[PDB]
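U., I forgot to send this yesterday:
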Amino acid sequence: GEENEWDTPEVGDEVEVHYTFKFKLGQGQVIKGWDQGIKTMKKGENALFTIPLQFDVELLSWTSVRDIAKDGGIFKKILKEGDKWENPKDPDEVFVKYEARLEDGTVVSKSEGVEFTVKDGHLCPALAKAVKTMKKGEKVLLAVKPQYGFGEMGRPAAGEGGAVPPNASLVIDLELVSWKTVTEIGDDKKILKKVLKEXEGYERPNEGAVVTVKITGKLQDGTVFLKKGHDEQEPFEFKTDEEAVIEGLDRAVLNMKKGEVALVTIPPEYAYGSTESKQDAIVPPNSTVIYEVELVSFVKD
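Result:
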Protein backbone atom coordinates (compact mmCIF):
# COMPACT_ATOMS: atom_id res chain seq x y z
CA GLY A 1 0.00 0.00 0.00
CA GLU A 2 0.92 3.65 -0.71
CA GLU A 3 0.43 7.41 -0.66
CA ASN A 4 -0.56 10.54 -2.60
CA GLU A 5 -1.02 14.11 -1.25
CA TRP A 6 12.17 20.98 2.56
CA ASP A 7 13.17 18.60 5.48
CA THR A 8 11.92 15.09 6.43
CA PRO A 9 11.52 12.83 9.55
CA GLU A 10 14.10 10.11 9.96
CA VAL A 11 13.94 6.62 11.39
CA GLY A 12 13.22 6.92 15.13
CA ASP A 13 12.31 10.69 15.30
CA GLU A 14 9.52 11.82 17.57
CA VAL A 15 6.67 12.72 15.16
CA GLU A 16 3.49 14.54 16.08
CA VAL A 17 0.59 13.94 13.72
CA HIS A 18 -3.11 14.45 13.24
CA TYR A 19 -4.76 11.42 11.69
CA THR A 20 -8.24 9.97 11.00
CA PHE A 21 -0.54 12.46 18.14
CA LYS A 22 2.35 11.27 18.59
CA PHE A 23 5.04 8.58 18.47
CA LYS A 24 8.52 7.26 17.64
CA LEU A 25 8.58 6.77 13.87
CA GLY A 26 9.33 3.28 12.73
CA GLN A 27 10.34 1.62 15.98
CA GLY A 28 7.74 -0.75 17.49
CA GLN A 29 5.36 2.16 17.97
CA VAL A 30 2.40 1.90 15.48
CA ILE A 31 0.89 -1.06 13.56
CA LYS A 32 4.08 -1.79 11.47
CA GLY A 33 1.98 -0.56 8.53
CA TRP A 34 1.79 3.24 8.14
CA ASP A 35 5.03 4.43 9.77
CA GLN A 36 6.92 3.63 6.60
CA GLY A 37 5.65 6.62 4.62
CA ILE A 38 5.67 9.39 7.27
CA LYS A 39 9.41 9.58 6.60
CA THR A 40 8.86 11.12 3.13
CA MET A 41 6.43 13.66 4.67
CA LYS A 42 7.22 17.33 5.24
CA LYS A 43 6.24 19.51 8.25
CA GLY A 44 3.07 21.46 7.03
CA GLU A 45 2.31 18.46 4.78
CA ASN A 46 -0.93 16.59 4.48
CA ALA A 47 -0.82 13.04 3.01
CA LEU A 48 -3.42 10.40 2.56
CA PHE A 49 -1.90 6.92 3.10
CA THR A 50 -3.68 3.89 1.60
CA ILE A 51 -3.17 0.47 3.23
CA PRO A 52 -4.69 -2.77 1.72
CA LEU A 53 -7.71 1.38 5.05
CA GLN A 54 -7.11 5.12 4.53
CA PHE A 55 -5.28 7.64 6.75
CA ASP A 56 -5.47 11.41 6.41
CA VAL A 57 -2.19 12.31 8.12
CA GLU A 58 -1.12 15.84 8.96
CA LEU A 59 2.54 15.70 10.01
CA LEU A 60 2.60 18.50 12.55
CA SER A 61 6.18 18.54 13.86
CA TRP A 62 8.99 16.21 14.93
CA THR A 63 12.07 16.27 17.18
CA SER A 64 15.12 14.38 15.84
CA VAL A 65 16.70 11.64 18.04
CA ARG A 66 20.37 10.73 17.49
CA ASP A 67 22.39 7.80 18.59
CA ILE A 68 25.55 9.80 18.84
CA ALA A 69 27.86 7.24 20.33
CA LYS A 70 26.48 4.55 17.90
CA ASP A 71 25.86 2.62 21.04
CA GLY A 72 22.44 3.53 22.35
CA GLY A 73 24.88 5.00 24.99
CA ILE A 74 23.63 8.51 24.38
CA PHE A 75 20.56 9.41 22.59
CA LYS A 76 20.45 13.08 21.68
CA LYS A 77 16.94 14.58 21.32
CA ILE A 78 17.01 18.07 19.70
CA LEU A 79 14.38 20.17 21.21
CA LYS A 80 15.66 23.41 19.57
CA GLU A 81 17.76 23.37 16.41
CA GLY A 82 20.81 25.51 16.58
CA ASP A 83 22.32 27.81 14.05
CA LYS A 84 24.34 27.42 10.84
CA TRP A 85 26.38 24.26 10.50
CA GLU A 86 29.53 24.15 12.61
CA ASN A 87 29.98 21.97 15.63
CA PRO A 88 32.75 22.76 18.11
CA LYS A 89 35.85 20.59 18.39
CA ASP A 90 37.98 19.12 21.04
CA PRO A 91 40.28 22.07 21.51
CA ASP A 92 37.23 24.61 21.58
CA GLU A 93 36.20 26.39 24.69
CA VAL A 94 32.31 25.86 24.69
CA PHE A 95 29.74 27.65 26.85
CA VAL A 96 26.83 25.61 27.91
CA LYS A 97 23.85 25.25 30.36
CA TYR A 98 22.55 21.82 31.40
CA GLU A 99 20.60 20.11 34.03
CA ALA A 100 21.36 16.56 34.81
CA ARG A 101 18.84 14.34 36.33
CA LEU A 102 18.37 10.79 37.46
CA GLU A 103 15.69 8.73 35.61
CA ASP A 104 13.19 9.67 38.37
CA GLY A 105 13.72 13.28 37.60
CA THR A 106 16.03 13.96 40.59
CA VAL A 107 18.33 16.88 39.77
CA VAL A 108 21.92 15.95 40.50
CA SER A 109 23.86 18.66 38.76
CA LYS A 110 22.97 21.82 36.96
CA SER A 111 24.45 24.82 35.49
CA GLU A 112 23.32 28.18 34.09
CA GLY A 113 26.32 28.77 31.96
CA VAL A 114 29.79 27.25 32.13
CA GLU A 115 32.66 27.14 29.83
CA PHE A 116 35.09 24.19 29.37
CA THR A 117 37.62 23.04 26.79
CA VAL A 118 35.75 20.24 25.03
CA LYS A 119 38.63 17.62 25.21
CA ASP A 120 38.88 18.23 29.04
CA GLY A 121 35.24 17.42 29.42
CA HIS A 122 32.75 18.51 31.93
CA LEU A 123 30.32 16.69 34.17
CA CYS A 124 30.48 13.33 32.58
CA PRO A 125 31.62 11.80 29.31
CA ALA A 126 28.29 12.51 27.63
CA LEU A 127 28.65 16.29 27.61
CA ALA A 128 31.86 16.55 25.54
CA LYS A 129 30.36 14.02 23.10
CA ALA A 130 27.02 15.72 22.81
CA VAL A 131 28.42 19.15 22.12
CA LYS A 132 30.70 17.89 19.38
CA THR A 133 27.56 17.16 17.41
CA MET A 134 25.58 20.22 18.34
CA LYS A 135 25.06 23.53 16.52
CA LYS A 136 25.28 26.93 18.14
CA GLY A 137 22.14 27.43 20.19
CA GLU A 138 21.17 23.73 19.79
CA LYS A 139 19.05 22.71 22.89
CA VAL A 140 18.84 18.95 23.57
CA LEU A 141 17.72 16.28 26.08
CA LEU A 142 20.25 13.50 26.42
CA ALA A 143 19.36 9.97 27.65
CA VAL A 144 22.56 8.73 29.04
CA LYS A 145 23.67 5.29 29.97
CA PRO A 146 26.14 4.64 32.80
CA GLN A 147 29.28 4.31 30.71
CA TYR A 148 28.86 7.90 29.51
CA GLY A 149 27.47 8.99 32.91
CA PHE A 150 29.58 8.05 35.90
CA GLY A 151 30.01 4.41 35.44
CA GLU A 152 30.39 1.93 38.27
CA MET A 153 31.92 4.29 40.81
CA GLY A 154 28.92 6.62 40.38
CA ARG A 155 29.33 9.81 42.07
CA PRO A 156 29.07 10.98 45.60
CA ALA A 157 27.00 13.94 46.91
CA ALA A 158 29.38 16.73 47.65
CA GLY A 159 27.67 20.22 46.86
CA GLU A 160 25.85 21.11 44.62
CA GLY A 161 25.95 17.32 44.14
CA GLY A 162 23.32 14.69 43.83
CA ALA A 163 24.86 11.37 44.47
CA VAL A 164 24.73 9.38 41.30
CA PRO A 165 24.17 5.70 42.22
CA PRO A 166 26.80 3.44 40.63
CA ASN A 167 25.38 2.23 37.27
CA ALA A 168 22.51 4.88 36.95
CA SER A 169 21.29 6.35 33.73
CA LEU A 170 20.97 10.15 33.45
CA VAL A 171 18.67 12.55 31.60
CA ILE A 172 20.44 15.88 30.75
CA ASP A 173 19.08 19.11 29.30
CA LEU A 174 21.98 20.58 27.50
CA GLU A 175 22.21 23.83 25.57
CA LEU A 176 25.31 24.72 23.54
CA VAL A 177 25.22 28.52 23.75
CA SER A 178 28.37 29.54 21.92
CA TRP A 179 32.09 28.69 21.67
CA LYS A 180 35.52 30.03 20.73
CA THR A 181 37.60 28.19 18.24
CA VAL A 182 41.00 27.03 19.42
CA THR A 183 43.45 26.03 16.78
CA GLU A 184 46.69 24.09 17.83
CA ILE A 185 49.64 25.76 16.38
CA GLY A 186 53.26 24.64 15.60
CA ASP A 187 54.60 21.32 14.27
CA ASP A 188 54.06 20.40 17.89
CA LYS A 189 50.54 21.72 18.31
CA LYS A 190 51.73 23.10 21.56
CA ILE A 191 50.67 26.70 20.87
CA LEU A 192 46.86 27.27 21.45
CA LYS A 193 45.24 30.08 19.43
CA LYS A 194 41.69 30.97 20.81
CA VAL A 195 39.78 33.30 18.42
CA LEU A 196 38.09 36.17 20.57
CA LYS A 197 37.10 38.21 17.59
CA GLU A 198 37.02 36.85 14.12
CA UNK A 199 38.84 38.81 11.53
CA GLU A 200 37.81 39.65 8.02
CA GLY A 201 38.00 37.63 4.78
CA TYR A 202 40.41 34.74 4.11
CA GLU A 203 43.88 36.30 3.76
CA ARG A 204 46.59 35.66 6.45
CA PRO A 205 50.06 36.99 6.61
CA ASN A 206 52.69 34.93 4.97
CA GLU A 207 56.23 34.36 6.03
CA GLY A 208 58.10 37.70 5.70
CA ALA A 209 54.83 39.80 5.84
CA VAL A 210 55.08 43.04 7.72
CA VAL A 211 52.33 42.90 10.31
CA THR A 212 50.89 45.61 12.56
CA VAL A 213 49.74 44.19 15.92
CA LYS A 214 48.49 45.14 19.41
CA ILE A 215 49.64 42.74 22.01
CA THR A 216 49.13 42.15 25.54
CA GLY A 217 51.08 39.49 27.38
CA LYS A 218 50.03 37.91 30.71
CA LEU A 219 51.18 35.22 33.03
CA GLN A 220 48.61 32.48 33.75
CA ASP A 221 47.40 34.14 36.92
CA GLY A 222 46.54 37.12 34.74
CA THR A 223 49.43 39.40 35.54
CA VAL A 224 50.16 41.82 32.59
CA PHE A 225 53.89 41.87 31.85
CA LEU A 226 53.72 43.38 28.40
CA LYS A 227 51.72 45.82 26.48
CA LYS A 228 52.73 46.84 23.04
CA GLY A 229 51.25 48.54 19.99
CA HIS A 230 48.05 49.81 21.77
CA ASP A 231 46.53 53.12 20.67
CA GLU A 232 48.10 55.12 23.54
CA GLN A 233 51.63 53.79 22.53
CA GLU A 234 53.62 54.00 19.27
CA PRO A 235 52.43 51.36 16.89
CA PHE A 236 54.05 47.99 16.89
CA GLU A 237 54.91 46.29 13.71
CA PHE A 238 57.20 43.35 12.96
CA LYS A 239 58.10 41.17 10.04
CA THR A 240 56.93 37.59 10.42
CA ASP A 241 59.12 34.56 10.22
CA GLU A 242 62.36 36.22 11.16
CA GLU A 243 62.31 35.61 14.88
CA ALA A 244 61.33 39.33 15.28
CA VAL A 245 59.19 38.24 18.29
CA ILE A 246 58.96 35.18 20.60
CA GLU A 247 58.19 32.12 18.45
CA GLY A 248 54.60 31.55 19.59
CA LEU A 249 53.51 35.01 18.63
CA ASP A 250 55.29 34.66 15.24
CA ARG A 251 53.49 31.41 14.52
CA ALA A 252 50.17 32.76 15.82
CA VAL A 253 50.04 35.83 13.70
CA LEU A 254 50.89 33.75 10.51
CA ASN A 255 47.50 32.08 11.23
CA MET A 256 45.50 35.12 11.88
CA LYS A 257 43.19 37.26 9.68
CA LYS A 258 42.97 41.07 9.53
CA GLY A 259 41.18 42.45 12.57
CA GLU A 260 41.40 39.08 14.39
CA VAL A 261 41.68 39.15 18.19
CA ALA A 262 43.21 35.99 19.65
CA LEU A 263 44.37 34.62 22.99
CA VAL A 264 47.50 32.74 22.40
CA THR A 265 48.74 30.22 24.93
CA ILE A 266 52.56 29.86 24.60
CA PRO A 267 54.65 27.30 26.48
CA PRO A 268 58.03 28.65 27.55
CA GLU A 269 59.96 27.04 24.73
CA TYR A 270 57.99 29.25 22.38
CA ALA A 271 58.20 32.33 24.59
CA TYR A 272 60.75 33.46 27.14
CA GLY A 273 62.44 30.16 27.69
CA SER A 274 64.49 29.47 30.85
CA THR A 275 65.64 32.92 31.75
CA GLU A 276 63.64 35.75 33.23
CA SER A 277 62.06 38.64 31.25
CA LYS A 278 61.88 41.92 33.29
CA GLN A 279 58.87 43.70 31.92
CA ASP A 280 55.85 45.18 33.73
CA ALA A 281 56.18 42.21 36.06
CA ILE A 282 59.13 39.70 35.66
CA VAL A 283 58.50 36.69 33.45
CA PRO A 284 59.78 33.91 35.74
CA PRO A 285 61.81 31.28 33.87
CA ASN A 286 59.73 28.39 32.46
CA SER A 287 56.36 30.41 32.29
CA THR A 288 53.63 29.66 29.89
CA VAL A 289 52.38 33.02 28.77
CA ILE A 290 49.10 34.15 27.33
CA TYR A 291 49.23 36.70 24.67
CA GLU A 292 46.30 38.73 23.62
CA VAL A 293 46.87 39.55 20.03
CA GLU A 294 45.17 41.88 17.67
CA LEU A 295 46.16 41.65 14.09
CA VAL A 296 45.71 45.21 12.98
CA SER A 297 46.86 45.03 9.43
CA PHE A 298 49.60 43.59 7.29
CA VAL A 299 51.34 43.69 3.88
CA LYS A 300 52.09 40.27 2.43
CA ASP A 301 55.64 39.50 1.21
